[PDB]
Amino acid sequence: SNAIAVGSERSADGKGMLLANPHFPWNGAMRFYQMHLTIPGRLDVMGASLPGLPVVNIGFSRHLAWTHTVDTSSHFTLYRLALDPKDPRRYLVDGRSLPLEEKSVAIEVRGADGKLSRVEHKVYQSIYGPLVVWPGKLDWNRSEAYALRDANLENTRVLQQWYSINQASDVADLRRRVEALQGIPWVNTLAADEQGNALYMNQSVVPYLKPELIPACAIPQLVAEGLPALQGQDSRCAWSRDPAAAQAGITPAAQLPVLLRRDFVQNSNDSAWLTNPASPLQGFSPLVSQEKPIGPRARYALSRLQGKQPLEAKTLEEMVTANHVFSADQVLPDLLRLCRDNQGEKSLARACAALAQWDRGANLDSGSGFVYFQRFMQRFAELDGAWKEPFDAQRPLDTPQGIALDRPQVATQVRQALADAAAEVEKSGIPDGARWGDLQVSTRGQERIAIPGGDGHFGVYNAIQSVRKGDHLEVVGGTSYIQLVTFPEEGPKARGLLAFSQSSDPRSPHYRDQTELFSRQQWQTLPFSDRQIDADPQLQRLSIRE
Amino acid sequence: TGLAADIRWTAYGVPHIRAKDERGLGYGIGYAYARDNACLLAEEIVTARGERARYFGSEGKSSAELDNLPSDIFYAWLNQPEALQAFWQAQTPAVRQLLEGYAAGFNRFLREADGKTTSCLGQPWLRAIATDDLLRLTRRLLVEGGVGQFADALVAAAPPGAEK
Ligand SMILES: *C(=O)CCCCCCCCCCC
């Protein structure tokens, strides 16, 4: 997901502005749905929501727009148990042997004969929560096992939290409502209001450990690998209690990152750190936020956002619709040099021609250079020390950059990587002169629709994830509900689309109507006022009761 | 009863729900959502109830790409009656009312559905829903950043035998 909130110091109109670009599945239990909710006098909010939820999850109201992105904070901790040496179904806390609890569930199973059989399954639980096994990493042997404590299992406040957000008036009110309830499970919140405040909150449900407990309570080898793992044989490693927290064992709101600015804030699924580089967010719990290198999407956004020039609505829209493959900016110049250095190389000829002719985009008409580049990058990712300039904490926006071609070992391996990528691309069945839009599609009934964008990992702001199915790449997730909100005098102006359309049912008039529009990148008004709604020549109305 | 909503749809089938209270508001939402997505919700509710294997056998998967039986085991564990009860009991009157309206609105569409915008008409798994079903979906989403990402791992967790 991407989110950009612009404030009075940088916006062209001097007011707030928000781009919401969540990246989520195109099917299933997290398929976004547009709706507008009004209880006249006290609730008037529009946006999109997940299936089954009677609240708006990402949206806007008269003076406010907000969105979310999946954060990098931990929302659970693993606990490594020390097992009773006499009994692998018992575990030690402060040297005392405790029994595991056994909870059975029974499931009905439809068999080949069409009849039902009852299957019983035992779930083992510790004081921390259920046991979990990752064969080869988190085993259950005679020495150790792993339990998992999920912080959001006790979060009964989640629905009230969004209903409260739905009622928020401005940025300050939104911040109060979120900090007061702490009902947000696993996302950042970014917002802008009419006044021109830009807000970022890393405000969610996060396991709390007092600072002095972490060194001794962490499992060093696992935390090194980005797993929130704690020592489960020591009662002092229980999540810390703080009366200011809305839920026992979670982090108080005052200890979670918040940035309130009048220029901009952004997030593309990295930590709070470089939300705005002018004001870095640092000194938080490792479970909350760390100073990790940002991904190419955030790096791309910051390269467009930094500076003194005012930001227009159009600017933010085009950051999505340009489909620029920002990872090319770091790699492609030197790759092309490598190409020019190897013109005698027959196996490199087609790849190098395709890369030289490529518009560095994931547009419908973008050349096969994108496909060659994708397969090279997957192999480039696995090479050791191949960056000309590796990541530099002192220069976190401009590194890594370039290929270290001046090192013979690197030059050999990069050329080999390109050779292997080329072979894999050509081993495929992609016809001559095929464009990206000829390959990446969304199936609709017997029909297909060409879809622009590409994987977020290659730094395309318009992130689209797809899987190979027959002769094509089938879109499975990515850009979903799009919302760009400004606040002119008459009322909020919202522009966007729901990329996969309102309905998942092929029989619906709204199964592919916005998907045709997403393909052409033609965003539309999201009508909010009674005037806007009444002006729609498609307007239909039904009143129902029982 | 005491449920009423005014729905306006603009281009692309976007509903604008007006009501005097949360019950009415939920009624509109559930109805409108059912019109576009009855089958999707029914399928995901089956998943969150841990009933995939019952309707579809052990060979299939959920939309999250988990095997039906392991998925069912996880959701039966997650959505136990006592967990649902305690969750409901912690809900404010307003949220309870939103949920009650939603279920009633969804079920109203189901009673009237003639297949116009519903492809799964006549399927045994397309059924009236309860507020508990919406709690099942909510809790499923709640654990997406936690134990949900370890669903297979939870099902796989069994004590060692006699091995070396
Ligand atoms: C990009 O990271 C996608 C962010 C998705 C936002 C979904 C809102 C969270 C709602 C959770 C409901 C329980």
XYZ file of C-alpha atoms and ligand atoms in Angstrom:
723
model
C 0.000 0.000 0.000
C 0.940 3.649 -0.494
C -0.386 6.684 1.361
C 0.473 10.382 0.970
C -0.956 13.205 3.066
C -0.170 16.761 1.970
C -0.575 19.853 4.131
C -0.969 23.621 3.818
C 2.761 24.312 3.371
C 3.064 22.147 0.228
C -0.405 21.855 -1.347
C -1.259 24.068 -4.338
C -4.486 25.328 -2.688
C -3.011 25.658 0.832
C -5.447 22.999 2.136
C -5.195 19.293 3.015
C -4.922 16.579 0.391
C -4.746 12.777 0.623
C -3.801 9.997 -1.773
C -4.994 6.544 -0.694
C -3.566 3.626 -2.679
C -4.000 0.380 -0.644
C -2.636 -2.841 -2.182
C -4.937 -5.751 -1.315
C -6.376 -9.009 -2.800
C -8.679 -8.850 -5.846
C -10.830 -11.672 -4.365
C -11.875 -13.189 -1.066
C -12.361 -12.001 2.490
C -10.319 -8.789 1.966
C -11.909 -7.591 -1.300
C -12.675 -3.838 -0.909
C -16.202 -2.549 -1.446
C -17.276 1.085 -1.944
C -20.059 2.637 0.137
C -21.348 5.912 1.565
C -22.943 5.928 5.063
C -25.196 8.687 6.423
C -27.176 9.187 9.628
C -28.314 12.774 8.972
C -26.930 15.157 11.589
C -24.229 12.923 13.082
C -22.591 10.611 10.514
C -21.661 11.237 6.882
C -18.707 9.271 5.573
C -17.708 7.639 2.286
C -15.063 5.137 1.228
C -14.413 1.416 0.971
C -14.575 -1.507 3.392
C -13.779 -5.215 3.749
C -16.509 -7.915 3.458
C -18.929 -8.222 6.390
C -17.995 -4.960 8.142
C -20.753 -2.305 8.637
C -18.216 0.560 8.859
C -16.052 2.428 6.350
C -12.372 1.299 6.571
C -10.687 3.850 4.234
C -12.615 7.011 3.349
C -13.409 10.672 3.782
C -15.960 13.035 5.296
C -16.757 16.783 5.142
C -13.384 17.974 6.501
C -11.267 14.793 6.693
C -9.770 12.010 4.616
C -7.882 8.987 6.022
C -6.254 5.786 4.813
C -4.149 2.856 6.067
C -1.053 0.842 5.194
C 0.159 -2.440 6.746
C 2.842 -1.482 9.306
C 6.168 -3.132 10.220
C 5.291 -3.366 13.944
C 4.879 -6.761 15.611
C 1.312 -7.707 16.603
C 2.224 -10.977 18.315
C 5.251 -12.546 19.986
C 6.442 -16.118 19.764
C 7.497 -17.715 23.043
C 10.213 -20.376 23.069
C 9.254 -22.896 25.756
C 11.727 -24.921 27.789
C 10.224 -28.418 27.980
C 10.037 -30.599 31.105
C 12.944 -33.058 30.679
C 10.614 -35.880 31.780
C 7.593 -34.922 29.661
C 7.445 -33.033 26.285
C 3.803 -32.155 27.035
C 4.953 -30.082 30.022
C 6.970 -26.841 30.020
C 8.973 -24.875 32.594
C 8.277 -21.380 33.939
C 10.716 -20.193 36.628
C 11.814 -23.835 36.854
C 8.261 -25.073 37.617
C 6.677 -27.746 35.405
C 3.312 -26.704 33.924
C 1.004 -28.941 31.866
C -0.118 -28.017 28.348
C -3.855 -27.690 27.906
C -5.471 -29.850 25.250
C -8.449 -28.458 23.378
C -10.151 -30.682 20.807
C -12.133 -29.431 17.837
C -14.346 -31.673 15.696
C -14.764 -31.081 11.951
C -17.257 -32.668 9.546
C -15.706 -33.894 6.294
C -17.587 -34.667 3.047
C -16.075 -37.825 1.555
C -15.827 -39.294 -1.947
C -19.097 -41.135 -1.243
C -20.710 -37.758 -0.427
C -21.251 -38.705 3.229
C -19.940 -36.884 6.311
C -17.191 -38.148 8.637
C -16.224 -36.528 11.947
C -12.525 -35.683 12.288
C -11.169 -34.804 15.727
C -8.038 -32.722 16.183
C -6.148 -31.736 19.345
C -4.889 -28.154 19.791
C -2.202 -27.802 22.455
C -2.111 -24.518 24.377
C 0.243 -22.885 26.882
C -0.363 -19.901 29.179
C 0.885 -17.812 26.214
C -1.425 -19.256 23.540
C -1.390 -22.195 21.090
C 1.712 -24.150 20.082
C 2.986 -23.642 16.516
C 5.382 -25.777 14.419
C 7.542 -24.654 11.446
C 9.378 -27.837 10.439
C 13.111 -27.133 10.433
C 12.877 -23.794 12.295
C 10.285 -23.883 15.082
C 10.105 -27.536 16.023
C 8.434 -29.314 18.905
C 11.108 -31.761 20.123
C 12.052 -33.040 23.613
C 13.893 -29.811 24.548
C 11.813 -26.978 23.158
C 8.603 -25.834 21.509
C 7.062 -22.518 20.451
C 3.793 -20.904 21.530
C 2.314 -17.731 20.007
C 0.580 -14.882 21.837
C -1.558 -12.784 19.467
C -2.212 -9.279 20.914
C -5.338 -8.775 18.790
C -7.168 -11.788 20.258
C -8.101 -9.527 23.190
C -8.832 -6.519 20.941
C -12.636 -6.404 21.204
C -12.480 -2.698 20.260
C -11.752 -3.073 16.519
C -15.286 -2.375 15.139
C -15.961 0.465 17.589
C -12.597 1.905 16.509
C -13.618 2.278 12.831
C -17.104 3.462 13.715
C -15.391 6.148 15.815
C -12.998 7.014 12.955
C -16.093 7.315 10.719
C -17.365 9.997 13.094
C -14.067 11.983 13.255
C -14.223 15.662 12.219
C -10.591 16.606 11.584
C -6.987 15.379 12.032
C -6.807 16.325 15.737
C -10.159 14.621 16.389
C -9.063 11.518 14.469
C -5.849 11.338 16.520
C -7.776 11.623 19.830
C -10.262 8.897 18.810
C -7.549 6.423 17.736
C -5.202 7.089 20.667
C -8.119 6.873 23.121
C -9.349 3.471 21.977
C -6.233 1.766 20.500
C -8.516 -0.523 18.471
C -6.475 -0.633 15.240
C -5.063 -4.182 14.711
C -2.171 -4.003 12.223
C -2.089 -0.817 10.141
C -0.648 2.677 10.032
C -3.104 5.558 9.675
C -2.409 8.580 7.439
C -4.776 11.573 7.088
C -5.211 15.130 5.893
C -7.914 17.654 6.815
C -9.361 20.822 5.241
C -7.154 23.028 7.482
C -4.035 21.482 5.912
C -2.747 19.191 8.662
C -0.884 16.076 7.507
C -0.959 13.195 10.025
C 0.887 9.872 10.308
C 0.144 7.388 13.107
C 1.874 4.074 13.752
C -1.031 3.579 16.200
C -2.000 -0.073 16.511
C -2.088 -2.996 18.968
C 1.537 -3.903 19.735
C 2.914 -6.201 22.512
C 4.591 -4.069 25.204
C 7.886 -4.873 26.886
C 9.611 -2.303 29.086
C 12.938 -1.245 27.458
C 15.173 -2.917 30.061
C 13.518 -6.336 29.491
C 14.247 -6.737 25.759
C 17.974 -7.636 25.786
C 17.385 -10.580 28.138
C 13.915 -11.541 26.879
C 14.671 -11.711 23.117
C 15.738 -14.900 21.321
C 18.825 -13.393 19.607
C 19.000 -15.711 16.563
C 15.264 -15.321 15.800
C 14.910 -11.567 16.339
C 17.905 -11.289 13.966
C 15.596 -12.891 11.381
C 12.719 -10.476 12.052
C 10.619 -12.827 14.199
C 9.294 -11.297 17.443
C 10.407 -14.125 19.724
C 10.701 -14.095 23.524
C 12.040 -16.380 26.291
C 9.009 -18.330 27.490
C 10.698 -20.011 30.501
C 11.004 -16.736 32.451
C 7.882 -15.123 33.937
C 9.653 -11.707 33.793
C 9.269 -11.917 29.971
C 5.469 -11.660 30.112
C 4.235 -8.563 28.236
C 4.527 -5.503 30.537
C 1.453 -3.914 32.140
C 0.947 -0.171 31.921
C -2.280 1.459 33.224
C -2.285 3.958 30.325
C -2.755 1.164 27.758
C -6.341 0.422 26.631
C -5.565 -3.302 26.880
C -3.318 -5.154 29.348
C 0.066 -6.015 27.835
C -0.113 -3.632 24.848
C 1.985 -0.525 24.203
C 0.545 2.823 25.505
C -0.364 5.302 22.727
C 2.217 7.866 23.922
C 5.005 5.401 23.093
C 3.921 4.784 19.482
C 5.174 6.931 16.554
C 3.052 9.919 15.502
C 4.046 12.690 13.074
C 1.915 15.812 12.705
C 3.146 18.154 9.977
C 1.968 20.797 7.545
C 4.108 19.750 4.572
C 3.717 15.983 3.953
C 3.833 12.484 5.424
C 4.052 9.199 3.495
C 4.217 5.454 3.947
C 4.718 2.493 1.631
C 4.911 -0.367 4.191
C 8.298 0.540 5.681
C 8.660 1.500 9.359
C 7.805 4.924 10.799
C 11.458 5.998 10.377
C 11.394 8.107 7.175
C 7.694 9.083 7.052
C 9.158 12.531 6.433
C 13.002 12.614 6.203
C 13.047 16.190 7.549
C 11.788 14.743 10.852
C 12.988 11.134 11.275
C 11.139 8.931 13.765
C 13.593 7.096 16.002
C 14.158 5.664 19.493
C 11.156 3.293 19.515
C 10.932 -0.343 20.674
C 12.273 -2.920 18.157
C 8.737 -4.421 18.263
C 7.383 -1.020 17.179
C 9.715 0.586 14.583
C 13.327 0.167 13.397
C 15.631 2.135 11.118
C 15.633 -0.412 8.269
C 16.440 0.550 4.636
C 13.260 1.718 2.870
C 11.807 -0.168 -0.123
C 11.794 1.225 -3.687
C 8.141 2.443 -3.494
C 8.883 4.803 -0.568
C 12.181 5.775 -2.160
C 10.270 6.639 -5.349
C 7.619 8.637 -3.440
C 10.225 10.628 -1.506
C 12.069 11.457 -4.760
C 8.865 13.121 -6.034
C 7.761 14.663 -2.709
C 10.996 16.229 -1.388
C 11.592 19.878 -2.303
C 9.877 23.260 -2.321
C 7.500 22.934 -5.286
C 3.751 22.862 -4.517
C 1.923 19.581 -4.972
C -1.196 19.376 -7.104
C -3.850 16.661 -7.089
C -2.651 15.814 -10.622
C 0.872 15.269 -9.283
C -0.321 12.592 -6.837
C -2.558 10.877 -9.395
C 0.296 10.651 -11.930
C 2.591 9.099 -9.302
C 0.206 6.129 -9.601
C -0.704 6.288 -13.321
C 2.858 6.814 -14.624
C 3.593 3.136 -13.767
C 7.300 3.976 -13.445
C 9.489 1.012 -12.505
C 11.681 2.876 -10.003
C 14.072 -0.073 -9.418
C 15.270 0.529 -12.988
C 16.671 3.911 -11.815
C 19.237 2.107 -9.621
C 20.122 -0.763 -11.951
C 19.277 -0.136 -15.633
C 21.893 2.545 -16.482
C 24.779 0.185 -15.592
C 22.987 -2.836 -17.046
C 22.832 -0.992 -20.398
C 26.556 -0.210 -20.096
C 27.154 -3.945 -19.588
C 25.046 -4.556 -22.715
C 27.127 -2.123 -24.814
C 30.250 -3.854 -23.456
C 29.035 -7.247 -24.756
C 27.700 -6.626 -28.280
C 29.523 -9.715 -29.591
C 27.470 -11.860 -27.194
C 24.715 -13.580 -29.199
C 22.840 -14.783 -26.095
C 22.610 -11.188 -24.805
C 21.360 -9.605 -28.057
C 17.569 -9.890 -27.637
C 17.574 -8.972 -23.924
C 19.823 -5.925 -24.434
C 17.762 -4.657 -27.405
C 14.533 -5.066 -25.393
C 15.999 -3.258 -22.345
C 17.376 -0.373 -24.462
C 13.953 0.147 -26.118
C 12.031 -0.113 -22.828
C 10.217 2.963 -21.512
C 11.071 1.889 -17.909
C 7.344 1.485 -17.262
C 4.661 -1.064 -16.467
C 2.168 0.593 -18.847
C -0.089 -1.474 -21.128
C 2.125 -0.525 -24.107
C 5.437 -1.007 -22.234
C 7.809 -3.270 -24.148
C 9.071 -6.734 -23.198
C 12.086 -4.997 -21.600
C 9.990 -5.027 -18.380
C 9.802 -8.848 -18.447
C 13.559 -9.155 -19.098
C 14.192 -6.654 -16.289
C 11.954 -8.569 -13.834
C 13.793 -11.860 -14.399
C 17.194 -10.172 -14.156
C 16.206 -8.488 -10.880
C 15.122 -11.809 -9.333
C 18.635 -13.078 -9.963
C 20.363 -9.780 -9.111
C 18.664 -10.006 -5.696
C 20.608 -13.206 -4.938
C 24.088 -11.867 -5.772
C 26.534 -10.870 -3.003
C 28.070 -7.367 -2.956
C 26.883 -6.400 -6.449
C 25.851 -2.799 -5.628
C 28.298 -0.087 -6.732
C 27.093 1.925 -3.731
C 25.593 -0.354 -1.065
C 22.967 0.939 1.389
C 24.311 3.869 3.372
C 22.510 4.877 6.600
C 23.998 8.375 6.133
C 22.381 8.465 2.659
C 19.172 6.438 3.177
C 17.337 7.967 0.180
C 20.035 7.562 -2.508
C 21.507 4.127 -1.726
C 21.828 1.391 -2.839
C 22.709 2.556 -6.391
C 24.535 1.152 -9.444
C 26.253 -2.107 -10.373
C 29.874 -2.621 -9.298
C 31.037 -3.473 -12.839
C 34.630 -2.420 -12.000
C 34.856 -5.587 -9.901
C 35.522 -8.534 -12.304
C 33.741 -11.111 -10.105
C 30.595 -8.933 -10.051
C 30.798 -8.222 -13.805
C 30.946 -11.983 -14.491
C 28.000 -12.787 -12.219
C 25.809 -9.929 -13.454
C 26.367 -10.901 -17.115
C 25.617 -14.534 -16.189
C 22.457 -13.385 -14.368
C 21.366 -11.524 -17.532
C 22.182 -14.589 -19.681
C 20.046 -16.806 -17.407
C 17.205 -14.265 -17.244
C 17.279 -13.960 -21.059
C 17.050 -17.751 -21.529
C 14.124 -18.011 -19.093
C 12.239 -15.206 -20.870
C 12.896 -16.720 -24.300
C 12.086 -20.252 -23.071
C 8.596 -18.818 -22.439
C 6.003 -18.527 -25.189
C 5.644 -14.750 -25.363
C 4.924 -13.836 -29.027
C 6.985 -11.328 -31.036
C 6.189 -7.677 -30.298
C 4.078 -8.533 -27.236
C 3.534 -5.648 -24.836
C 3.147 -5.856 -21.028
C -0.639 -5.366 -21.375
C -0.752 -8.385 -23.694
C 0.560 -10.483 -20.749
C -0.946 -9.111 -17.539
C -4.724 -9.413 -17.410
C -7.776 -9.853 -15.211
C -10.146 -12.562 -16.433
C -13.848 -11.644 -16.485
C -16.122 -14.512 -17.531
C -14.710 -15.745 -20.857
C -13.131 -12.331 -21.426
C -9.867 -10.680 -20.346
C -8.973 -7.083 -19.492
C -5.395 -5.779 -19.789
C -4.115 -4.401 -16.451
C -1.385 -1.715 -16.018
C 1.118 -1.799 -13.152
C 3.656 -4.270 -11.816
C 5.089 -5.734 -8.629
C 5.700 -3.316 -5.745
C 9.073 -4.984 -5.147
C 10.273 -3.487 -8.467
C 9.262 -0.001 -7.218
C 6.082 0.455 -9.271
C 3.894 2.742 -7.129
C 0.874 1.158 -8.866
C 1.682 -2.247 -7.359
C 0.071 -5.223 -9.085
C 0.750 -8.818 -8.125
C 0.013 -11.552 -10.665
C 0.472 -15.306 -11.132
C 1.042 -17.361 -14.272
C -2.118 -19.090 -15.493
C -1.913 -20.663 -18.951
C -0.845 -18.092 -21.544
C -1.121 -15.066 -19.257
C -0.352 -13.430 -15.931
C -3.528 -13.318 -13.828
C -3.843 -10.366 -11.426
C -4.387 -11.541 -7.812
C -3.764 -8.412 -5.723
C -2.532 -4.827 -5.651
C -4.095 -1.457 -6.385
C -7.692 -1.829 -5.296
C -9.709 1.098 -3.888
C -8.184 4.389 -5.087
C -9.098 7.635 -3.373
C -7.653 11.115 -3.992
C -9.327 13.762 -1.819
C -9.047 17.582 -1.886
C -11.159 20.189 -0.061
C -12.400 23.023 -2.268
C -14.945 25.513 -0.836
C -18.098 23.619 -1.901
C -17.152 20.346 -0.138
C -14.645 17.470 -0.438
C -13.666 16.483 -3.977
C -12.945 12.761 -4.231
C -11.527 11.107 -7.307
C -10.717 7.439 -7.870
C -11.908 3.950 -8.755
C -12.368 0.464 -7.397
C -9.976 -1.367 -9.755
C -11.729 -4.757 -9.720
C -15.303 -3.279 -9.635
C -18.049 -3.497 -6.948
C -19.214 -7.039 -7.617
C -17.396 -10.387 -7.622
C -20.411 -11.995 -9.320
C -20.180 -12.414 -13.153
C -23.946 -11.809 -13.426
C -23.690 -8.264 -12.061
C -23.734 -5.081 -14.190
C -20.856 -4.030 -11.874
C -18.591 -7.038 -12.361
C -16.100 -5.329 -14.726
C -17.341 -1.752 -15.382
C -14.616 -0.036 -13.290
C -12.023 -2.594 -14.431
C -12.442 -1.397 -18.010
C -11.799 2.122 -16.626
C -8.799 1.032 -14.492
C -7.274 -0.507 -17.651
C -7.477 2.891 -19.386
C -6.462 4.635 -16.117
C -9.526 6.920 -16.174
C -10.369 7.852 -12.583
C -13.849 9.159 -11.791
C -15.680 11.362 -9.294
C -16.699 9.657 -6.069
C -19.974 11.578 -5.478
C -20.481 12.545 -1.818
C -22.768 15.597 -1.620
C -26.517 15.443 -2.332
C -25.890 17.765 -5.321
C -23.238 15.365 -6.757
C -25.442 12.289 -6.129
C -28.535 13.938 -7.640
C -26.602 15.026 -10.763
C -25.734 11.359 -11.613
C -27.887 10.326 -14.646
C -27.620 6.689 -13.467
C -29.151 7.500 -10.050
C -31.395 4.795 -8.633
C -33.214 4.727 -5.295
C -34.842 2.073 -3.129
C -36.302 2.379 0.358
C -36.632 -0.857 2.350
C -38.062 -1.865 5.742
C -39.133 -4.854 7.842
C -38.053 -5.117 13.002
C -37.686 -1.339 13.477
C -35.364 -1.622 10.462
C -35.515 0.878 7.597
C -33.060 2.312 5.084
C -32.927 4.656 2.112
C -30.461 3.497 -0.543
C -29.274 5.490 -3.539
C -26.909 3.971 -6.116
C -24.735 6.153 -8.332
C -22.701 5.016 -11.394
C -20.761 1.745 -11.047
C -23.219 0.473 -8.384
C -21.932 2.526 -5.446
C -24.543 2.596 -2.654
C -25.300 5.635 -0.501
C -27.149 4.421 2.586
C -29.290 6.814 4.678
C -30.895 5.804 7.999
C -31.971 7.264 11.331
C -29.991 4.800 13.483
C -27.299 2.103 13.403
C -29.833 -0.768 12.915
C -31.289 0.930 9.847
C -27.817 1.838 8.599
C -26.643 -1.803 8.855
C -29.838 -2.976 7.161
C -29.010 -0.855 4.072
C -25.356 -1.992 4.002
C -26.129 -5.723 4.280
C -28.806 -5.447 1.599
C -26.637 -3.452 -0.834
C -23.578 -5.648 -0.234
C -25.639 -8.819 -0.793
C -26.868 -7.477 -4.147
C -23.267 -7.355 -5.439
C -21.535 -9.998 -3.312
C -23.911 -12.520 -1.686
C -21.894 -15.525 -2.931
C -18.519 -14.121 -1.787
C -19.785 -13.476 1.751
C -21.458 -16.899 1.978
C -18.196 -18.615 0.938
C -16.081 -16.595 3.422
C -18.559 -17.268 6.216
C -18.269 -21.022 5.495
C -14.491 -20.540 5.820
C -14.747 -18.588 9.128
C -17.218 -21.160 10.541
C -14.686 -23.946 9.764
C -17.148 -25.724 7.486
C -15.195 -25.903 4.181
C -14.572 -29.665 4.359
C -18.245 -30.291 5.171
C -19.478 -28.625 1.949
C -16.446 -29.093 -0.330
C -14.345 -32.035 0.877
C -10.709 -32.134 1.950
C -9.242 -31.694 -1.554
C -10.144 -27.993 -1.945
C -8.746 -24.765 -0.515
C -10.144 -21.519 0.864
C -9.692 -18.172 -0.934
C -6.655 -17.636 1.358
C -5.193 -20.752 -0.337
C -5.232 -22.902 2.846
C -6.282 -26.576 2.608
C -9.935 -27.013 3.642
C -9.369 -29.281 6.687
C -6.424 -27.341 8.244
C -8.403 -24.127 7.561
C -11.496 -25.589 9.269
C -9.447 -26.714 12.276
C -7.963 -23.231 12.643
C -11.321 -21.441 12.405
C -13.116 -23.927 14.685
C -10.368 -23.211 17.215
C -10.453 -19.432 16.613
C -14.232 -19.031 16.556
C -15.259 -21.222 19.495
C -18.698 -20.381 20.985
C -17.159 -18.917 24.181
C -14.785 -16.653 22.207
C -17.712 -15.391 20.094
C -19.857 -14.874 23.212
C -17.196 -12.858 25.089
C -16.483 -10.809 21.935
C -20.210 -9.969 21.506
C -20.531 -9.087 25.175
C -17.687 -6.533 24.840
C -19.492 -4.721 21.965
C -21.154 -1.304 22.443
C -24.924 -1.055 21.723
C -24.187 0.921 18.506
C -21.913 -1.815 17.085
C -24.384 -4.562 18.082
C -27.064 -2.611 16.207
C -24.852 -2.177 13.104
C -24.282 -5.927 13.079
C -27.932 -6.845 13.691
C -29.075 -4.590 10.817
C -26.391 -5.964 8.453
C -27.470 -9.578 9.026
C -31.146 -8.673 8.565
C -30.396 -6.668 5.367
C -28.261 -9.414 3.864
C -30.981 -11.984 4.674
C -33.654 -9.764 3.154
C -31.811 -9.781 -0.191
C -31.465 -13.595 0.062
C -35.251 -14.062 0.494
C -35.875 -12.037 -2.669
C -32.959 -13.197 -4.855
C -33.940 -14.598 -8.248
C -30.437 -15.032 -9.726
C -30.326 -11.595 -11.418
C -26.988 -10.806 -9.676
C -26.397 -14.056 -7.713
C -24.611 -17.034 -9.379
C -24.747 -19.415 -6.390
C -28.521 -19.454 -6.055
C -29.624 -22.908 -4.844
C -26.245 -23.854 -3.331
C -26.615 -25.450 0.146
C -23.964 -23.038 1.530
C -25.926 -19.938 0.467
C -27.935 -19.407 3.649
C -29.351 -16.845 6.038
C -26.646 -15.334 8.261
C -26.528 -14.469 11.968
C -24.604 -11.762 13.848
C -22.277 -14.577 15.055
C -21.247 -15.083 11.410
C -20.170 -11.432 11.212
C -18.208 -11.908 14.455
C -16.520 -14.921 12.803
C -15.464 -12.741 9.841
C -14.307 -9.900 12.121
C -12.129 -12.171 14.272
C -10.685 -13.796 11.127
C -9.558 -10.312 9.978
C -8.417 -9.382 13.479
C -5.766 -12.147 13.562
C -4.441 -11.519 10.024
C -1.353 -9.786 11.525
C -0.905 -12.479 14.198
C -1.941 -16.139 14.709
C -3.747 -16.107 11.312
C -0.346 -16.103 9.530
C 0.488 -19.250 11.553
C -2.729 -21.191 10.824
C -0.895 -24.106 9.126
C 1.751 -24.066 11.907
C -0.904 -24.285 14.632
C -2.563 -27.286 12.939
C 0.865 -28.965 12.462
C 1.837 -28.616 16.177
C 2.025 -32.084 17.773
C 4.336 -33.520 20.468
C 7.278 -35.786 19.527
C 7.012 -39.578 19.457
C 9.839 -41.961 20.359
C 12.381 -40.685 17.770
C 16.151 -40.111 17.697
C -2.077 -1.831 2.373
O -1.155 -2.143 3.136
C -3.495 -2.290 2.599
C -4.081 -1.781 3.909
C -5.454 -2.419 4.114
C -6.342 -1.593 5.040
C -7.473 -2.434 5.621
C -8.058 -1.767 6.867
C -7.865 -2.651 8.106
C -9.219 -3.143 8.609
C -9.105 -4.312 9.588
C -10.498 -4.809 9.993
C -10.443 -5.821 11.135
